[model samples]
Target: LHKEPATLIKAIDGDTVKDMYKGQPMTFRLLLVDTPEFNEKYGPEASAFTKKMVENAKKIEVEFDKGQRTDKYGRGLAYIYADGKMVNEALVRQGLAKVAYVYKGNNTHEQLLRKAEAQAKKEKLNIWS
Candidate 1:
């Protein structure tokens, strides 16, 4: 539960963002979720949703989970919060994304995420639609 209060500088698709870490630049790819690619189907809509989530945040926090702080690309794997809502979970609930990138040790977060994904699929919303 490492927290870094930061500003979201840009949204690079639905699951990734560029933020200003104090005066330095940092990138965050939301953990436990995977959205459509920017060049793939439904990608644009997902990106739009992500942009809306952070646009009026006023404050953003990048909270890292256990294991694999950063991927090989150097982007921090985190759960981002906008004002207080978990943005990753928000997207999952919308069915705009699915639970992914879960390794062996992080079962709690994965369980909640899978639950959200299931409900979304059951309702046939967004990607599930």
Candidate 2:
């Protein structure tokens, strides 16, 4: 994996983050997942969960999507890893996010994320409930 280290500046939302990457500030949209909006149900909970994870993590890293680097809004597209766990998958596993925005050839951990989502669905956790 071609992961690069990053420092958490803020958690913009459950699926978005502001970080310092390579000494520059960057906002990232967590790839392959969509969390509820800040005004929607469970939104704050999801955001809080993300914030806590990243804030408490000893290391943060991001892996860019091979097929795309940024979205139309100029947000960097990546898979965020806190400590050693993939935060994108963790959100899905917790049912705070749903697998979405998947693009062909851009998915590096699709199967892993899908499996997490499936387990969450089966368990009726959070949004899945």
Off by over 4 Å in 1: 106-108
Reference-based TM-score, model 2: 0.97
- Candidate 1: which pairs clash? none
Q: Give the 10-residue window scoring lowest on summed lDDT in candidate 1.
A: 103-112
Looking at model 2, residue 30 earns an lDDT score of 95
User: Between which residue pairs do clashes occur in model 2?
Assistant: none
lDDT for each residue of candidate 1 in 23-126, tens digit (9 for 90 to 100): 77888899899999989877898899889898879889987776777889999888889989888898999998889888765434777788889999999998
lDDT of 2 by residue, 1-129 (tens): 588999999989999999999999999999999999989998998999999999999999999877989889989999999998999999999999999999997898999999999999999999998
